[PDB]
């Protein structure tokens, strides 16, 4: 009756150090709707993230998209601290520039 | 190809804290065109597409009235269903809904559907012929009997056919530069080193619309490979990648095939320096 | 344009 989310962290455009960009965290396939997502920078929470609206797939499993604005640099590390009812402990997905 | 106009509804029953949430978004193809939310103080049917804002206030008033009627019926559905399963009055339960209609290449009706769920389990739905239901369990077995006497299927079918094809044709006519567009993905391929004697090729396809696309890996003729859900880019386009673990040395024996509407011919990708 | 017909409540 309950499923676990599938988390992907990526950037809208191919990231380049110095050009404005966006960071997305697309969690899909979970149930129920009540989820907590946060976009982290250097382990700290980013204050200006905003999300799309609650849709669901053909098998009645939701999905969302949290995005914000950022500029890449070699000394900064980003992540996405997702937490759901089924997740006993939070899942901290990092952002690697090759996925 | 074809075109779609689907609606999604949700009602999460928050107990003790007040009234259930309600989000009612509407889709044309893969593009959101209208919005709703029971938490924001606007309490209107806000737009989300820069080709529907140009309509008058009677349209918005009608949409708001109908959406609030949908919310009022969802609340009663949640209450009765929670009461009917002999559950307690402290958990949170979800009710969902979906209906739409598809027009063919001639912009004439092809197929319409209308489903209904509860806690992620199918509850009731119209069949493909739009004449009978598909009740799955006992509660659905009673809902079917209740709705086969009021002729709900007939009203749903008349609405779907007439009004849905009319509205979708109007929306397609207005959104000529946005709804009737197709984008060709930009494709490139990468390389990794999983171990000291292997590799991991990865086929990328970015910024395509509509959402559907097929990526297949073929070892010089025969297909096998891990895929990912197609993911939005945040501005109307999509992204996708597919990868497979390959033994080292045999890097020229693998091909990636791309099939999209905006691509007249299939794309083959092979590794190069 | 959302469904503008009459509304019915799920029973049991």
Numbering used by the authors:
A (entry chain B): 1 to 99
B (entry chain A): 1 to 224, 228 to 276
C (entry chain C): 1 to 12
Give the article text.
To further investigate the structural differences between these two peptide epitopes, we conducted cryoEM analysis of MAGEA4 and MAGEA8 pMHCs in the absence of TCR. 3.4 and 3.1 Å resolution reconstructions were obtained for MAGEA4 and MAGEA8 pMHCs, respectively. The maps were sufficiently resolved to define the conformations of HLA-embedded peptides. The side chain of the central R6 residue was not well-resolved, consistent with its flexibility in the absence of TCR. As expected from their conserved sequences, the structures of MAGEA4 and MAGEA8 peptides were highly similar. The most notable difference occurs at peptide residue D4. The D4 side chain projects down toward the HLA α2 helix in the MAGEA4 peptide, while it protrudes up, away from HLA groove in the MAGEA8 peptide, appearing to form a salt-bridge interaction with the R65 side chain at HLA-α1. The structures of MAGEA4 and MAGEA8 pMHCs suggest that different conformations of peptide residue D4 are key for discrimination. Taken together, our structural data indicate that preferential binding by these TCRs for MAGEA4 is likely due to interactions that require the peptide D4 to be in a down conformation where it does not interact with HLA residue 65.
